């Protein structure tokens, strides 16, 4: 990557320390930018959801796959749960999203708690598989928590058969009191819902799909136990990409695990991490990993820097690892440290094929965690780290190891008061990346990497401009 | 521009990172400094008001033109509105400012709301074109909001015929209860008002005038649609300077727009932006632009740095672009990032012929926005960015593009509790620039650029000294 | 009035010290109660608006007359203003209320300020006398204060010809976004508006009308100057009832004023006050007053009790004065001390034919005072006393008398956040009085007075029950 003349600092750089210098551009519109990655992950946007149980959820898997990203299922997850998640995700419609379905015999408290699992803001009441009404927080207020859904269902809603183009669906929702359109199967049963903004996103985003046309989903493996058997089980479960994830990827056990997984001829892209050095990246690639995850410390839930002093500023680690990987024909993923879309844009300009986002997406409706409200009624979700699940492996022995494992760091991730869904965060990230590409003058991510000119700034340089509003960032 | 020996940082510098080293000076008095620019814009002070609808107003146009600056009317403004604004501004007196005129049949609420549109603090009551009394917030308090002006007009005020020198007008207002002197036409009709400080400013500031002696006013054009026709219409409307404004000035569409506008032989200075690179500046100049606006990111309403990572510290961008422009005989304008008069002084020392100021002037009475009061009764005005108006261009399509445009960032710009007018901000800026010139030893802005010696400081270096009081800065 | 056995306190009683004992009742429904008074004032509800400039307004006059009450115009008001108010009030429709009319050339600030002068919450935009749209606070938010009404008018609204019954109008407003129905004249011009609740109130309340069928309005005279000439001028102005109002009604000047007014054979009911004694009531009646206002001290703006020690608990004064008046065939009005509808009910049970309400109605949209918002954005209106206007009458002399006049007491009357109109207060008062009549067993106010059984309670007795919500009371 090219830097400005004289911009050779005596220290490693974070995303806060660097900026993109605009160049001559033929890309006028942001829609002219192709955001598809070339690392073999199949994502049409450079966003990858981290393999953390607080963020990598089933609903998030479906949503991110529909919007073009991929979700790495967290490691040590039961094979039955992984198989169920893959079966559900790969059965989802490419355009129509799955709503919250309630039977009329359900309770009002159950409806209210289930309502916030999606960004639609309304839940479809179905009887015998056919939609009956919409449950909304407006009609659930002031109602007994254990009344039946029959007493709160709203009999009016917009219907359209599945397969209708987003144009008419957007037109139908022009003056609908509820912004949710209930898509119906040709036999009349519920096929899903299409939000007014969901139609636009379907027109804009191309879903990340496998060879069979189903939504892509990834899974993660630890290096504890028989890594080969776990990788084989995850491959047979339907995972389209395997991630070997460890806190310290540049270690002998990681190389052995990569060799074991790569020796099975599994036919899937191999992701290994994390390393922050060129030597670690080259060792991981030579072990058999096609993609090398980058970043030790910048994770928002990571306490390695404060507890151990071990780490590296994410931007410099990503540039070094990307240079090392593309020297050998591999790719890298920027993992951790993503707070703003500028972080994604700089990671892509740094040479990363994909950017892994963790705790930022935890503050979304689609996150597996339960939505919580603080004393000010501001919605939030708890984000927690993988902790021992990312480490290398009688109650006495359990407590003995547990005395030294890193604690589970917990943080409050406030939801956007109006745009709390993960689709809105994806919109912000993709719009920022497309703006970066237009400023650089690139129609695709590889052109963004080759054509980018970067500079170094001080704290005052980062302080320039308007901060993003609350909810738009982590 | 010359830097101190060894001051070659490995990063780009903002205004916060640089300081001016005093040199041998023959300029003892600040009034000995000539602040007139040499870029062809005709401004007698280096202050230019940004083409933002929140700041670039009709009253601000008149005031800034009278005080020697110029105001760029925001782009996409209707041609009828632009023509009306130019006709009003160019009909204003060079010395006497236009007051708030109220008929005796007007309401008290209307008088109170209109009172804060000017910095005078009093509104002239006129009957049949002749002044009758002064409406002041003091006499509007405790009065029914829909009483007539007749019940609140103050029958006493200082009168003087138009053309009287500022000396006698200042003498007449020595002990007047209201600091406003009502200037009258030779036939007795109202010709305007001359504030006690307005007389001093008229004695100090030389208005920016065109060949016909009328106040100068500028207009802006976007690069969407037929740029040539819009430039022709703005030229026929009476604009003395045309600004081609885009978020990314270093793009093919911008070069085409500059070529189209410059091919009309319009006979006006051409301003294009924004770029932060020497290549962009040279390309814009070769396209036909006499002046190149500089700055992508430092705008207070700009979220490009946080959303996209694209940007550049304003001082380094300005020095590079000014060197590139004066290498080809052109000029540059420093756009955005101006919070204190030191920013203007450093931009001028950096090589910028003019400095463009945006959201800072939004917190003034003359700003087109309505004056607002927070919970603490502190006056403020809302400043908002151009957003899609600075970008490159069925409700479905409108929402589809609108999903990716940068949001309209809004900020609170508190007015100075005692000096809320834009004339006071101009006084602070011009006094700071004159002090910088005296410290350097220069009697004019070009001498300021050639003779300046600059240094680099850390955060502690910027922390030295006394911060400016509230209202004096953005 | 009959009291409970043994309930003979050694002190005078307020409304707080007494309660109504329910009796055998044949009145099952509250609509079976006839609230019409028999004092000759012509009011169909026992509510009279006090002659205070803070409450007795033109809009309040129209509204209260339409709902069946009467409004006494404050004394010392100019005869031209009184004539204009009477002409406007008597030209109002008996069913359709006058809206806030805005021309399309009006400003947004003017529309917003005028919007709260009525309880409709919407203002009708009229061009050439024909309605065009509705201005609402929803569409006035975020708009420039001096934009034209054209930019904020809402093109949709419910129309119905004048004379349509309230049934269809209520049906038409079943799902209208704005609760205002624009009534049109047969030629298409605006005839007024009919609020959804206004239709119900028209079906419930019978307007107080004179012999010619126009809305009734009263006026007040002080005892300073030529009282006879002022009474004659007010009678020719169209007032249907004259009130001779003084702080101390039991004085020689008051008797002379009553004799002078009653000697003109004006043909209108005569109201004189205030007295709190049987002797004062009998003297006022023998002087020529048909109705005697009762109460010295209980007025919310009255400081006589605290400043002078002179006063009387309102309930005992009302019972004594009512007994004295009906001993001579006269009537009394309970003036002051009305905070809750229970005060009106007890005053009626005490023998008062009508109840005069002052500062309580000042916290309404129809009040002549301007609507104000405190630091918590809670709407309120300032209520102030008559002060010297209720008393007995060179700047030195003016200051000499002014040194001894009672100060103008000012209080904050918070508006009901949802029911800020005076029609809602009238609804509460009338519903409470009807409930009292049903509990007593009376179909009319005279039967309420004869059939009521009252008791005495301590502070704990008053503390029993649920307090009324905010806005429902003073
Ligand atoms: N009636 C009803 N129950 C639901 C619905 N979605 C989920 N549930 C129930 O709630 C449980 C938790 O829901 P989810 O959190 O979406 O399920 P999950 O498999 O844990 O998915 P993630 O948290 O996204 O990883 C499910 O196991 C169901 O029992 C719905 O639409 N309707
Ligand atoms: N009576 C009266 N009305 C005024 C006066 N100045 C402005 N107005 C009215 O208020 C409206 C808004 O005023 P301005 O904001 O100064 O006008 P503008 O053309 O929008 O100018 P900018 O906001 O400075 O761009 C005008 O269109 C007039 O209708 C004045 O002195 N007297
Ligand atoms: N455009 C317009 N102006 C109005 C309207 N109502 C009142 N005004 C104006 O505002 C002034 C004050 O209104 P009001 O307070 O209702 O008039 P008022 O005669 O003082 O009546 P009260 O305060 O009720 O005693 C009037 O003199 C008019 O100039 C309306 O509907 N439209
Ligand atoms: N050391 C450590 N890293 C973690 C933990 N949880 C998440 N991470 C790392 O941080 C990344 C997410 O960073 P984020 O996007 O939340 O800033 C994950 O993909 C993973 O690499 C943890 O408990 N410990
Ligand atoms: N990208 C961007 N730049 C803006 C916007 N509004 C204003 N600007 C830039 O910021 C300048 C003003 O900066 P300020 O003086 O307010 O710090 C303008 O002249 C323009 O160049 C906006 O919405 N987006
Ligand atoms: N003494 C005195 N009485 C007043 C004043 N203002 C109003 N009042 C009395 O108080 C009555 C209204 O009482 P309220 O209903 O506000 O409690 C009026 O009708 C009048 O009799 C004032 O300034 N002084």
Q: Taking CA A286 as the corner, what is the angle to CA A282 and CA A289, rounded to the nearest 5 degrees?
A: 90
Closest atom of ligand 1 to A56 CA is 25
Return the SS3 of C148: strand
Pairwise CA distance, residues A362 & A56, whole Å:
8
The answer to whether the CB of A64 is under 6 A from ligand 4 is no
Pairwise CA distance, residues A75 & A239, whole Å:
12
Task: Mutation target for A interface from B3, B11, B456: give the one with most A CBs within 10 A.
Answer: B11
Closest CA to B151 of B110, B108, B114: B108
CB A228 within 8 A of CB A260: yes
**Facing C110 at nearest CB: one of B110, B369, B370:** B110
Task: Mutation target for C interface from B370, B373, B375, B408: give the one with most C CBs within 10 A.
Answer: B370
Q: Which ligand is nearest to the CA of B57?
A: 2
CA B388 to centroid of ligand 6, rounded, Å: 60
Q: B409 at the A interface (CB within 8 A)?
A: yes
Q: Which two tokens stand for residue C433?
A: 């009085």
C370 vs B contacts (CB less than 8 Å) = 144-146
Pairwise CA distance, residues C354 & C37, whole Å:
7
Say which experimental method was used.
cryo-EM
Whether C110 sits inside 8 A of B114 (CB atoms) is: no
Q: How far is CA B347 from CA B302, B316, B363, B454, B474, in A?
A: 19, 10, 22, 12, 17
Closest atom of ligand 3 to C103 CA is 1
Closest CA to B13 of B376, B314, B309, B233: B314
**Which of A51, A55, A86, A100 is the pocket-test mutation for ligand 1 (most atoms within 8 Å of CB)?**
A100
In three-state form (DSSP H/G/I as H, E/B as E, the rest C), the secondary structure along chain A is CEECCCCCCCCCCCCCCEEEECCCECCCCHHHCECCCCCCCCCCCCEEECCCCCCCCHHHHHHHHHCCCEEEECCCCCHHHHHHHHHHHHCCCCCCECCEEECCCCEHHHHHHHHCCCCCCEEEEEECCEEEEEEEHHHHCCCCCCCEHHHCCECCCEEEECCCCHHHHHHHCCCCCCCEEEEECCCCCEEEEEEHHHHHHHHHCCCCECCCCCECCEEEECCCCCHHHHHHHHHHHCCCEEEEECCCCCCHHHHHHHHHHHCCCCCCCEEEEEECCHHHHHHHHHHCCCEEEECCCCCCCCCHHHHHCCCCCHHHHHHHHHHHHHHCCCEEEEECCCCCHHHHHHHHHCCCCEEEECHHHHCCCCCCCCCEECCCCCEEEEEECCHHHHCCCCHHHHHHHHCCCCCCCEEEEECCCCCCCHHHHHHHHHHHHHHHHHHHCCCEHHHHHHHCEEEEECHHHHHCCCCCCCCCCC
Pairwise CA distance, residues C467 & C1, whole Å:
27
Burial of C110 by CB count in 10 Å (0-12 exposed, 13-18 middle, 19+ buried)? buried
From C371's Cα to the closest Cα of chain B, the distance in A is 9
CA B308 to centroid of ligand 4, rounded, Å: 23
**Which of A51, A52, A114, A134 is the pocket-test mutation for ligand 1 (most atoms within 8 Å of CB)?**
A114
CB B269 within 8 A of CB B242: yes
B375 vs C contacts (CB less than 8 Å) = 375
Alpha carbon of residue C300 to chain centroid:
15
Peptide bond into B474 cis (omega under 30): no
DSSP summary character for residue B310: B
Q: Which two tokens stand for residue A30?
A: 């942001």
Q: How many CB atoms lie within 10 A of CB C196?
A: 19
Q: Is C402 annotated as a binding residue?
A: no
Pairwise CA distance, residues C380 & C55, whole Å:
13
The answer to whether the CB of B386 is under 6 A from ligand 5 is yes
Instruction: Name residue, tokens 């708890």.
Output: A382
Q: Which two tokens stand for residue C150?
A: 């054209």
Cβ–Cβ pairs < 8 A, chains B and C = 22
Q: How many CB atoms lie within 10 A of CB B393?
A: 13
DSSP summary character for residue C68: T
Closest atom of ligand 1 to A110 CA is 1
**Which of B100, B103, B362, B364 is the pocket-test mutation for ligand 2 (most atoms within 8 Å of CB)?**
B100
Q: Kindly tell me the sign of the dihedral angle through the C-alpha atoms of B359, B363, B368, B373.
A: positive
Return the SS3 of B194: strand
C253-278 in b/e form (b: 16+ CB < 10 A) is ebbebbebbbeeebebbbbbbbbbbb
C144 vs B contacts (CB less than 8 Å) = 369-370
Chain A: list its partners (3+ Cβ pairs within 8 Å): B
Whether C113 sits inside 8 A of B145 (CB atoms) is: yes
The answer to whether the CB of B74 is under 6 A from ligand 2 is no
B101 vs C contacts (CB less than 8 Å) = none
The answer to whether the CB of B114 is under 6 A from ligand 2 is yes
Q: B229 at the A interface (CB within 8 A)?
A: no
Q: C398 at the B interface (CB within 8 A)?
A: no
Q: C146 at the B interface (CB within 8 A)?
A: yes
Return the SS3 of B402: helix
In a 13 Å sphere around the CA of C74, the CA atoms on its Cβ side amount to 20
B358 vs A contacts (CB less than 8 Å) = none
C114 vs B contacts (CB less than 8 Å) = 146
List, by residue number, the catalytic residues of A: 302
Nearest CA in chain C to B375: C375
Which residues of A line the annotated binding site? Answer: 245-247, 295-297
CB B322 within 8 A of CB B330: no
Strand order in the sheet with A453-456: A2-3, A453-456, A18-21
CB C423 within 8 A of CB C59: no
To what resolution in angstroms was this structure determined? 2.5
Chain B: list its partners (3+ Cβ pairs within 8 Å): A, C
Q: A433 at the B interface (CB within 8 A)?
A: yes
CA C84 to centroid of ligand 3, rounded, Å: 12
At C249, give phi and psi (nearest 5°): -75, -20
CB A182 within 8 A of CB A157: yes
The answer to whether the CB of B74 is under 6 A from ligand 5 is no
Beta-bridged to residue C97, according to DSSP, are C193
Task: Mutation target for A interface from B6, B307, B394: give the one with most A CBs within 10 A.
Answer: B307
Pairwise CA distance, residues B75 & B244, whole Å:
9
How do beta strands A180-184 and A158-161 pair?
A: parallel
Closest CA to A289 of A307, A267, A271, A268: A271
Burial of C98 by CB count in 10 Å (0-12 exposed, 13-18 middle, 19+ buried)? buried
CB B418 within 8 A of CB B446: no
CB B424 within 8 A of CB B64: no
Which residues of A line the annotated binding site for NADP(+)? Answer: 245-247, 295-297
A474 vs B contacts (CB less than 8 Å) = none
Closest CA to A193 of A102, A108, A89, A101: A101
The answer to whether the CB of A358 is under 6 A from ligand 4 is yes
User: What residues of chain A, 282 to 341, have a C-beta less than 8 Å from chain B?
Assistant: 340-341
**Which of B49, B52, B59, B361 is the pocket-test mutation for ligand 2 (most atoms within 8 Å of CB)?**
B59
């Amino acid at each position: 990557v090219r830097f400005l003349d004289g911009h050779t600092p005596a220290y490693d750089l974070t995303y806060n320390d660097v900026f993109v210098v605009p160049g001559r551009s033929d890309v006028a519109s942001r829609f002219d930018v192709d955001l598809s990655t070339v690392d073999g992950s199949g994502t049409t946007i450079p966003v990858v959801v981290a393999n953390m149980t607080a963020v990598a959820g089933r609903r998030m898997a479906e949503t991110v796959a529909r919007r073009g990203g991929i979700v790495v299922l967290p490691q040590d997850l039961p094979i039955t749960a992984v198989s169920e998640t893959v079966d559900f995700v790969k059965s989802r419609d490419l355009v129509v999203d799955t709503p919250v379905t309630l039977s009329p015999e359900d309770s009002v408290s159950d409806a209210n708690a289930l309502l916030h699992k999606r960004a639609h803001g309304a839940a479809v009441v179905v009887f015998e598989g056919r939609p009956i009404g919409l449950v909304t927080e407006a009609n659930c207020a002031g109602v007994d928590r254990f009344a039946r859904v029959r007493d709160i269902a709203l009999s009016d809603f917009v219907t359209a058969p599945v397969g209708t183009d987003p144009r008419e669906v957007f037109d139908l929702l022009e003056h609908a009191p509820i912004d949710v359109a209930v898509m119906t199967a040709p036999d009349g049963t519920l096929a899903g819902v299409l939000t007014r903004t969901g139609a636009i996103r379907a027109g804009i985003y191309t879903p990340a799909v496998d060879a069979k046309g189903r939504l892509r989903i990834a899974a993660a493996v630890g290096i504890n136990g028989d890594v080969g058997a776990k990788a084989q089980a995850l491959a047979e479960a339907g995972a389209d990409l395997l991630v070997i994830d460890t806190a310290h990827g540049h270690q002998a056990k990681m190389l052995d695990a990569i060799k074991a997984v790569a020796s099975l001829d599994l036919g899937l892209p191999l992701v290994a991490g994390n390393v922050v050095s060129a030597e670690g990246t080259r060792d991981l690639i030579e072990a058999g990993a096609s993609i090398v995850k980058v970043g030790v410390g910048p994770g928002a839930m990571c306490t390695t820097r404060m507890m151990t002093g071990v780490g590296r500023p994410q931007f410099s680690a990503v540039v070094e690892c990307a240079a090392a990987a593309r020297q050998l024909g591999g790719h890298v993923w920027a993992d951790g440290g993503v707070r703003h879309p500028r972080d994604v844009a700089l990671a892509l300009a740094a040479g990363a094929s994909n950017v892994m986002i963790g705790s930022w997406f935890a503050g979304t409706y689609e996150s597996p965690g339960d939505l919580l409200f603080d004393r000010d009624d501001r919605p939030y979700k708890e984000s927690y780290g993988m902790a021992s699940k990312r480490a290398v492996a009688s109650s006495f022995d359990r407590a003995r190891k547990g005395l030294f494992e890193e604690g589970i760091s917990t943080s409050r991730m406030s939801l956007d008061p109006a745009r709390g869904g993960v689709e809105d965060l994806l919109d912000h990230i993709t719009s920022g990346v497309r703006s970066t590409c237009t400023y650089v003058g690139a129609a695709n991510l590889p052109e963004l990497h080759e054509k980018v000119v970067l500079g170094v700034q001080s704290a005052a340089g980062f302080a320039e401009g308007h901060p993003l509003p609350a909810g738009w960032t982590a």
